[PDB]
Ligand binder design. Structure first.
Ligand SMILES: Nc1ncnc2c1ncn2[C@@H]1O[C@H](COP(=O)(O)OP(=O)(O)NP(=O)(O)O)[C@@H](O)[C@H]1O
Ligand SMILES: Nc1ncnc2c1ncn2[C@@H]1O[C@H](COP(=O)(O)OP(=O)(O)NP(=O)(O)O)[C@@H](O)[C@H]1O
Ligand SMILES: [K+]
Ligand SMILES: [K+]
Ligand SMILES: [Mg+2]
Ligand SMILES: [Mg+2]
Ligand code: NA
Ligand code: NA
Ligand code: NA
Ligand code: NA
Ligand code: NA
Ligand code: NA
Lengths: 394, 394
């Protein structure tokens, strides 16, 4: 109708249509760019960023312990006994801790001088936590003293010098902003799972988790490393072989350890990591591993006549069904996909991991006929049963 | 030995250990944050960023056509007939096009005034393309004239006014930097696949692709939209039902269209989108869809006695085996995971999509017993065959 008609022509698209966000404004306006979502997944990312920085001190050899506490007030506190965040004035004229807390693309991980091998690389993590917290407190033990700083809705207060101490390290306590997050209710089992991974990947490290909100205490320390991680993955799954396969390899700027064992189950349990970061969606290290494994198993099965010349090749899916594996890459110059680091991008890590897996898995299969035969049996007998059922579909 | 021993104690960790990168320096130093990798996946991301901006003009209703050309020199040229990038001086004192090409977190998509619904939201895309190109040229048709700008290793030259024209729009041509990328060899089929998706999702839009490097020409225009996308997905897969299921729903700040059809094959072919962006790793819209579908099929199968009361429930995997589906969400305030936008994060979109799918799929199953029975048969007979084979494993 005439009455319904409105003056609703679109606004002019000009220079003033283009807005520039300040750094921390960009985190608050577009948190998904940095943490994926403002749901449970993104809330936990705040813990990951702070714990990753403590783990980076451990990987450098300075930290031996990470203490994580979820306080009754919903704040998270992460303590390490590493070198401490510098508090001396930065060239920019603020305390160095204020630089990292308030500036994007600021940090000590843009070269290999401070951390040779680190999960950190963007200079963003702790600034995101500050941006998306109503409050952040830091206690740094350095240069013979305690140092205290706080951030009030991301804005620094005045650095305060405390008492004398010979200890060094960093404590970060943050209050996730309820105006950003749909929930601030951390999941203890989610946090325990990730801290357990970090301990399995760093067999010298101890991590302690305490939840004071009204199991509330775990200690994570696994001197048996990736082999014990696979034992843990297979604990509910019934191993179909007595051995855990474990090997490593080294190239210019990169190393890999792989542990793996097949079970009686129908799930793929392949966990991939770079510099302790959980690359949930995989990437070049997982692709190299998968390529090698499918090649070695098919070559072995055909050589040993376990696969008929007629029979189609075993697929990656056929082979990885019932596989538990951990792939841990150490890389001087990681390429991660985004701040959530879901994938390793390094093109050179694909051929490196593929090469080491090809060599080590070919050797293992050749040297272990009884176990190799059971694994090939599993992969075949499954594929064969799946096809016979599919052909009986009416 | 004594001779092997070196003065290799680590450098002091102080204020000068902390470096701040300029914006485009951060893209060149850490391209993975923005494009995932410097391999083939990241190279193609440069095309995606430029084409997404043209698609955003089409979604706003200003552009009708996107022309993509891969030149013999390895440059990519993207033309749209939208409003043009503003060239007038920005408040910051440079031409507005220079602001978007040189500054991170700068753009017209931080509110809904310029673009109501856009894949763009970070103000980063075109600055990444510039940062990772040795050269970028822009031709803007606006205000009665052609305007020309170039960027030389990301640095703007002087904006030049050209001839008169009543036309409006934007052409971007960029030369991917071979010092950043392991390969600059674009894959025609990779580009064709993505442009085809954009056309299926925007049934009024025409996209043309030309490859002049020494099939070299495609036109993408699909007035049949998501229904014709599903027809295309199932073309090699043998539909097991005569219908394509197609429905939509609307809520405050969001809409969804879903088209789906089951086939005789053993693959899941579910493609999910938000504001035309391909959310390859899914997210809240895919989770809502999956939850609804598993609920509706199990409820239907039990109500109709197609599943014995004894029988275990059909799993999501059982149900989605042989499923072709397209989920297209339109959202005023998208939350994407990272600049590669692999996942939709919006918590409210999960319950929205789940609600619409629950209502529309329950209705479709009830109204279409012959097709519903065949789909349940497929899901059961498969699961049943898979289990019988697994139990015959020795
Ligand atoms: N627990 C810590 N101990 C010592 N130094 C730390 C600690 N946490 C942060 N830092 C320093 O602060 C810098 C900034 O940290 P952060 O913002 O998390 O970025 P990053 O770790 O360098 N990279 P990323 O985490 O990938 O964004 C680090 O590079 C260190 O130099
Ligand atoms: N083809 C185009 N036509 C008109 N305006 C454009 C075009 N390309 C870019 N722009 C403008 O330039 C701004 C910056 O673009 P870009 O750097 O890609 O960021 P964005 O599209 O806003 N967000 P994102 O792509 O998610 O980083 C856009 O928001 C528009 O205002
Ligand atoms: K920082
Ligand atoms: K921009
Ligand atoms: Mg960090
Ligand atoms: Mg864009
Ligand atoms: Na009107
Ligand atoms: Na580094
Ligand atoms: Na210390
Ligand atoms: Na030495
Ligand atoms: Na917007
Ligand atoms: Na136009």
């Amino acid at each position: 109708s005439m009455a319904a008609q409105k003056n609703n022509a679109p606004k002019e698209y000009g220079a003033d249509s283009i807005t520039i966000l300040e750094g921390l404004e960009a985190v608050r306006k577009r948190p998904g760019m940095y943490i994926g979502s403002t749901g449970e997944r993104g809330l936990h990312h705040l813990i990951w960023e702070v714990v990753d920085n403590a783990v980076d001190e451990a990987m450098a050899g300075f930290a031996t312990r990470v203490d994580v506490k979820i306080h009754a007030d919903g704040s998270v506190e992460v303590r390490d006994d590493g070198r401490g965040i510098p508090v001396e004035m930065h060239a920019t004229g603020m305390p160095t801790i204020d630089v990292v807390m308030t500036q994007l693309h600021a940090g000590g991980k843009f070269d290999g001088e401070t951390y040779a091998v680190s999960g950190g690389l963007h200079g963003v993590g702790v600034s995101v936590v500050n941006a998306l917290s109503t409050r952040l407190e830091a206690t740094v033990l350095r240069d013979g003293y305690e140092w205290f700083q706080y951030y009030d809705r991301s804005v620094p207060g005045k650095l305060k010098q405390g008492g004398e101490t010979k200890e060094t390290g960093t404590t970060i306590r943050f209050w996730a902003d309820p105006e950003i997050f749909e929930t601030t209710d951390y999941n203890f089992e989610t946090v325990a799972r990730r801290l357990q991974e970090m301990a399995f990947l760093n067999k010298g490290l101890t991590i302690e988790l305490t939840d004071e909100r009204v199991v509330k205490h775990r200690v994570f320390h696994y001197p048996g490393g990736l082999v014990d991680y696979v034992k843990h993955i297979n604990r509910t799954k019934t191993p179909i072989q007595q051995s855990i396969i474990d090997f490593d390899g080294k190239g210019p700027g990169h190393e890999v350890e792989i542990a793996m064992q097949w079970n009686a189950g129908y799930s793929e349990s392949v966990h991939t990591f770079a510099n302790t970061i959980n690359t949930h969606e995989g990437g070049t290290h997982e692709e190299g591993f998968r390529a090698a494994l499918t090649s070695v198993v098919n070559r072995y099965a055909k050589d040993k006549k376990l696969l008929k010349d007629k029979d189609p090749n075993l697929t990656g899916d056929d082979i990885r069904e019932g596989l538990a594996a951990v792939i841990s890459v150490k890389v001087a110059e990681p390429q991660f996909e985004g701040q959530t680091k879901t994938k390793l991008g390094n093109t050179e890590v694909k051929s490196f991991v593929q090469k080491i897996c090809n060599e080590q898995l070919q050797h293992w299969f050749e040297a272990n006929p009884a176990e190799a035969k059971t694994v090939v049996n599993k992969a075949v007998s499954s594929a064969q049963a799946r096809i016979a059922a599919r052909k009986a579909r009416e």
